[model samples]
Target: AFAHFVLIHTICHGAWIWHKLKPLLEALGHKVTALDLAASGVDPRQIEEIGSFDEYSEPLLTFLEALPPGEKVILVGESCGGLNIAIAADKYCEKIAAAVFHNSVLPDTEHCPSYVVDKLMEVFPDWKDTTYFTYTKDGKEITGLKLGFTLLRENLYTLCGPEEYELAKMLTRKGSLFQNILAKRPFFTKEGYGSIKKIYVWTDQDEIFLPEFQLWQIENYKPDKVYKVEGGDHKLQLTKTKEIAEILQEVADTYN
Candidate 1:
């Protein structure tokens, strides 16, 4: 069965990151939609305007809400984009056939919304030249971060082509995890988010999100299935497009 795939990019990244994987899925007869969250990609809104994770996620939430009645989509999220998938699944569980974590964070309803982000802070390595800035949102200070060139090349884009690396440097924008808002927000409900089938795709060579963190997540809340790609880095969609596409196809057929 053909599937409708909704691709969500990570923090500081835009829909453009899915350039390789999107076409591969389309060639397999899957319908794909790569979305740009509020302040990322070509979206006109700025980070300062996004006060909460829900606000930053408005673009995705709005898109899912507008889907034709009874239609379901397979959400494929990378990095922090996993939270966006979790949020959407919470409200539109019945509309989501499955949620795929592609070198992404996987959140469970058992902890606070900031659980993964906080754990990430504890395990994250030196970002080289990566920089963080603060912006005022609703009379409060909010933090935003941008990926650095050296860090991007050494970590996130290790296995990608030079052009792909340059394209990422040219397009990546400042983004936030909205940890403050998440700290205060409610957890995902079992009936809403836990009800959907979850699949995790990761690699041991991923530098950005280390293998240890990925394993910890899987152990924390087991997924329906887990697949590890050999020699692939953090950006599997770019580093191993065909393999990831095949996995998506398998997910579609199996779930259908």
Candidate 2:
């Protein structure tokens, strides 16, 4: 059964992350859509205007809400985008056949896990100094993440070539307000999110979510299937989109 596929990207990134795979999926007779969260990509929303995780994720949330009831979608999220996918599956799992976590963090069922959030805050303790975010109110608030050249080459596209990395930096924009996401505490139900099949892809060389961290989440929140690729870095969607797409195709065929 051919199905609709919706792809979500990481923080500060937009739908452009999935460019390598969108066309491939469509050519194979499947419906594919990639999105930029509220203020990311070409979107103009500022972080100060986004009040909560729900607001930052409204674009994709509304997309799922607007879908015709009976159509089933295969949802895949990478990075922070996975959290939004989890909520959508929680609320609209009946419309979603399955969900995939592509080197992304899974939200806690109770409170925000004391583990992931703090560690994320530590990812760039000096983020105010890095290009990742713009400082606000003496660093109390963040307007958005500034995307360009520097640590990103090593942190995000480690395995990608210089040209590829340049394209990513060029297309990306200021969209994420890190603190807003850090303060989030998400909740979901077993009947909604737990009822559907889940898959997690492990990007082996990812410096962003190192092996120890990846293993922690997997051990805590077990998925139906786990895929490990030894060569890629944090942003596999850029380095190996076609490989991931094939994996998704493998997943679609098996699950359906």
Highest lDDT model number: 1
Instruction: Report the lDDT tens digits of candidate 2 across residue range 1-256.
Output: 4668899887777888788778888776788989878877878775566655566778887898889868788988887776777667777888887788888886555545234546655653443224544445333565466644665777777788787787777876666534454464455567787678888897868876777777877887788899987687888877777778788887888775
How many pairs of residues collide in model 1? 0
Give the range of the ten consecutive residues with the poorest summed lDDT in model 1: 117-126
Would you estimate the TM-scores of all the predictions?
0.98, 0.86
Q: What is the lDDT of residue 244 in candidate 2?
A: 83
lDDT tens digits, residue span 60-119, model 1: 999999999999999999999889988898888889999999999998899998898788
CA displacement after TM-score superposition, residue 60 of candidate 1 (Å):
0.8
lDDT of candidate 1 at residue 203, scale 0 to 100:
95
Global lDDT for candidate 2? 0.73
Residue-level lDDT for 106 in candidate 2: 65
- How does each model score on lDDT? 0.90, 0.73
